[PDB]
Amino acid sequence: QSMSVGFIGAGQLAFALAKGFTAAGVLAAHKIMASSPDMDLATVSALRKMGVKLTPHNKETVQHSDVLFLAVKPHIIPFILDEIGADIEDRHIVVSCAAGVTISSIEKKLSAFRPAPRVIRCMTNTPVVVREGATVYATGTHAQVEDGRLMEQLLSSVGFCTEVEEDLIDAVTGLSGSGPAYAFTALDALADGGVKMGLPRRLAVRLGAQALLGAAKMLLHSEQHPGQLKDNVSSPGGATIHALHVLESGGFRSLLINAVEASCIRTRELQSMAD
Amino acid sequence: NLYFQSMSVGFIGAGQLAFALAKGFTAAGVLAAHKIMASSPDMDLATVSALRKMGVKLTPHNKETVQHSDVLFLAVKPHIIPFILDEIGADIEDRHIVVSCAAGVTISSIEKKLSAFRPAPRVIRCMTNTPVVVREGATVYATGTHAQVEDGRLMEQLLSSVGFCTEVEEDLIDAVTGLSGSGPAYAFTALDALADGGVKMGLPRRLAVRLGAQALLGAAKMLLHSEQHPGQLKDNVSSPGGATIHALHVLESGGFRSLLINAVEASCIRTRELQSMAD
Amino acid sequence: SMSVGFIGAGQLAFALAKGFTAAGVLAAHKIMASSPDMDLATVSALRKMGVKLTPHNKETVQHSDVLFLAVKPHIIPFILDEIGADIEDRHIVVSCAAGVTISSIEKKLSAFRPAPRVIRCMTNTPVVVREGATVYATGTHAQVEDGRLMEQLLSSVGFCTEVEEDLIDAVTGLSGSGPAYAFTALDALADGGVKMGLPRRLAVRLGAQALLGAAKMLLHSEQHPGQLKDNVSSPGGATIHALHVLESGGFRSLLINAVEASCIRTRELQSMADQ
Amino acid sequence: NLYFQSMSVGFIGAGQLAFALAKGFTAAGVLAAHKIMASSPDMDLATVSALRKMGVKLTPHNKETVQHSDVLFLAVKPHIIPFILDEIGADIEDRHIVVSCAAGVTISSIEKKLSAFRPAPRVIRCMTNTPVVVREGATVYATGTHAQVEDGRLMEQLLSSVGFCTEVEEDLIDAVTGLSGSGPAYAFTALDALADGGVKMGLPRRLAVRLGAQALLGAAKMLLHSEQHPGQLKDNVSSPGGATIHALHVLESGGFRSLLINAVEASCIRTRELQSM
CA–CA dist B131, B213 (Å, integer): 14
- Identify which of D103, D76, D109, D90 has the alpha carbon closest to the alpha carbon of residue D10: D76
CA–CA dist C230, A188 (Å, integer): 10
Burial class (CB in 10 A: 0-12, 13-18, 19+), D146: middle
Burial class (CB in 10 A: 0-12, 13-18, 19+), A115: exposed
In single-letter form, the type of residue at position A39 comes to: M
CA–CA dist C252, C229 (Å, integer): 14
Those residues with Cβ within 8 angstroms of residue A212's Cβ, 6 or more apart along the chain or in another chain: A183, A186, A187, A190, B183, B187, B216, B217, B219, B220
CA–CA dist D139, A266 (Å, integer): 47
Those residues with Cβ within 8 angstroms of residue B219's Cβ, 6 or more apart along the chain or in another chain: A127, A179, A180, A183, A184, A187, A212, B233
Alpha helices in chain C (DSSP H): 11-23, 41-49, 57-63, 76-83, 102-110, 144-155, 168-171, 178-195, 200-220, 225-232, 238-248, 251-274
CA–CA dist A148, A143 (Å, integer): 7
CA–CA dist C59, C64 (Å, integer): 9
CA–CA dist A266, A257 (Å, integer): 14
Q: Do D196 and B249 touch (CB under 8 A)?
A: yes
According to DSSP, the β-strands at B57-59 and B9-12 are unpaired
Please state, as a whole number, how many other Cβ atoms lie within 10 Å of the Cβ of residue C72.
Answer: 16
Those residues with Cβ within 8 angstroms of residue B82's Cβ, 6 or more apart along the chain or in another chain: B109, B113, B278
Nearest to C224 among B229, B253, B262 (CB): B229
CA–CA dist A217, B224 (Å, integer): 15
The CA R_g of chain D, rounded to the nearest whole Å, is 21
**DSSP run (H or E) holding C69:** strand C66-69
- Vertex B203 angle, CA B197 and B205, to 5°: 80
In single-letter form, the type of residue at position D176 comes to: V
CA–CA dist A175, D59 (Å, integer): 51
Please state, as a whole number, how many other Cβ atoms lie within 10 Å of the Cβ of residue A259.
Answer: 30
| Mutate which: A221, A224, A228, A232, vs B, most B CBs within 10 A | A232
Which residues of chain A neighbour B266 with C-beta distances below 8 Å?
A: 239, 242-243, 245-246
In single-letter form, the type of residue at position A227 comes to: G
Which residues of chain B neighbour D196 with C-beta distances below 8 Å?
A: 238, 245, 248-249, 252
Binding residues of A for L-proline: 166, 239-240
- Identify which of A126, A200, A170, A184 has the alpha carbon closest to the alpha carbon of residue A260: A170
Q: Do B223 and A216 touch (CB under 8 A)?
A: no
Write the DSSP string, chain B.
----TT--EEEE--SHHHHHHHHHHHHTTSS-GGGEEEE-S-TT-HHHHHHHHHT-EEES-HHHHHHH-SEEEE-S-GGGHHHHHHHHGGG--TT-EEEE--TT--HHHHHHHHHTTSS--EEEEEE--GGGGGT-EEEEEEE-TT--HHHHHHHHHHHHTTEEEEE--GGGHHHHIIIIITHHHHHHHHHHHHHHHHHHTT--HHHHHHHHHHHHHHHHHHHHT--S-HHHHHHHH--TT-HHHHHHHHHHHTTHHHHHHHHHHHHHHHHHHHHHHH-
Angle of helix C238-248 versus helix B256-278 axis, rounded to 10: 130
CA–CA dist A201, A50 (Å, integer): 32
C163 touches chain A (CB under 8 A): no
Could you give the 3-state DSSP secondary structure of residue C149? helix
CA–CA dist B70, B96 (Å, integer): 5
Which residues of chain D neighbour C238 with C-beta distances below 8 Å?
A: 103-104, 177-178, 181-182, 266-268, 270-271, 274
- Identify which of D124, D196, D122 has the alpha carbon closest to the alpha carbon of residue D155: D124
CA–CA dist A238, B270 (Å, integer): 7
Nearest to C247 among B228, B253, B261 (CB): B261
Cα–chain-centroid distance for residue B227? 26
- Vertex D272 angle, CA D267 and D273, to 5°: 95
* Dihedral sign for Cα atoms in the order C121, C127, C128, C130: negative
Those residues with Cβ within 8 angstroms of residue B155's Cβ, 6 or more apart along the chain or in another chain: B71, B97, B99, B124, B126, B141
Distances from the Cα of D208 to the Cα of C175, D193, D194, angstroms: 9, 10, 8
Which of B69-86 are b and which e, b meaning 16 or more Cβ less than 10 Å from the residue's Cβ? bbbbbbbbbbeebeebbe
Q: Do D271 and C234 touch (CB under 8 A)?
A: no
Could you give the 3-state DSSP secondary structure of residue D129? coil
CA–CA dist D90, B66 (Å, integer): 51
CA–CA dist B56, B251 (Å, integer): 46
CA–CA dist B232, B252 (Å, integer): 17
Alpha helices in C124-236 (DSSP H): 144-155, 168-171, 178-195, 200-220, 225-232
Which residues of chain B neighbour C227 with C-beta distances below 8 Å?
A: 229, 231-232
Q: Does the annotation list B62 as a binding residue?
A: yes
The DSSP call for residue C115 is S
The answer to whether A120 and A94 are in contact (CB under 8 A) is: yes
Which residues of chain A neighbour C230 with C-beta distances below 8 Å?
A: 191, 195, 201
D259 touches chain B (CB under 8 A): no
Could you give the 3-state DSSP secondary structure of residue D55? coil
Please state, as a whole number, how many other Cβ atoms lie within 10 Å of the Cβ of residue A212.
Answer: 31
CA–CA dist D77, D99 (Å, integer): 14
Which residues of chain A neighbour B180 with C-beta distances below 8 Å?
A: 207-208, 210-211
Distance to chain B for D200, nearest Cα, Å: 4
Please state, as a whole number, how many other Cβ atoms lie within 10 Å of the Cβ of residue C13.
Answer: 28
Angle of helix D256-275 versus helix C178-195 axis, rounded to 10: 40
CA–CA dist C69, D213 (Å, integer): 27
The answer to whether C98 and D243 are in contact (CB under 8 A) is: yes
Cα–chain-centroid distance for residue A44? 18
- Identify which of C226, C225, C212, C157 has the alpha carbon closest to the alpha carbon of residue D134: C212
CA–CA dist D235, D30 (Å, integer): 41
End-to-end Cα spacing for chain C: 41
Q: Do B202 and A246 touch (CB under 8 A)?
A: no
Q: Do B255 and C249 touch (CB under 8 A)?
A: yes
